[PDB]
Design a protein around this ligand. Structure first.
Ligand SMILES: O=C(O)CCCn1nc(C(F)(F)F)c2c1CCCCC2
Length: 134
């Protein structure tokens, strides 16, 4: 209880850095990278008991995941990968690992001042996405 209080809310993307290169590293093709790179999603995070729900809504795609910390689940990503995901809390950071096709990427979400900072990492390539309260 209260495990993710400071994440809960409605958040809007305000800045992105290096996201094209992250998407390339992931294997996203040209047209999806261009279209997806324009999106300014709203991320809606809620908690009900042990179940955390993260919704992302944008002009590109709407996605939704619900999960229990430490318990693997199937996820269809915004770029249409079919991945196996596990999300844990490590020192106050939500750590989301996605596995598919022998590959792996990690998305970390943390609270920093009034922002929610999302770091997406694949091999040597990081992207930072900054969200503010909507
Ligand atoms: O939460 C975040 O800001 C970023 C992580 C999720 N996310 N959001 C989008 C986009 F561009 F469609 F919005 C994509 C991905 C997965 C990575 C592949 C590109 C599509």
């Amino acid at each position: 209880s209260h495990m993710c209080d400071a994440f809960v809310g409605t958040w809007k993307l305000v800045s992105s850095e290096n996201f094209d290169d992250y998407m390339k590293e992931v294997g996203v093709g040209f047209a999806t990278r261009k279209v997806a790179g324009m999106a300014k999603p709203n991320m809606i995070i809620s908690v009900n008991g042990d179940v955390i729900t993260i919704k992302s809504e944008s002009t590109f795609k709407n996605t939704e995941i619900s999960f229990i910390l430490g318990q693997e689940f199937d996820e269809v990503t915004a770029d249409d990968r079919k991945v196996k995901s596990t999300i844990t809390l490590d020192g106050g950071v939500l750590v989301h690992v996605q596995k598919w096709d022998g590959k792996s990427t990690t998305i970390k979400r943390k609270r920093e001042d009034d922002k929610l900072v999302v770091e997406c990492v694949m091999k040597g390539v990081t992207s930072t996405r900054v969200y503010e309260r909507a």
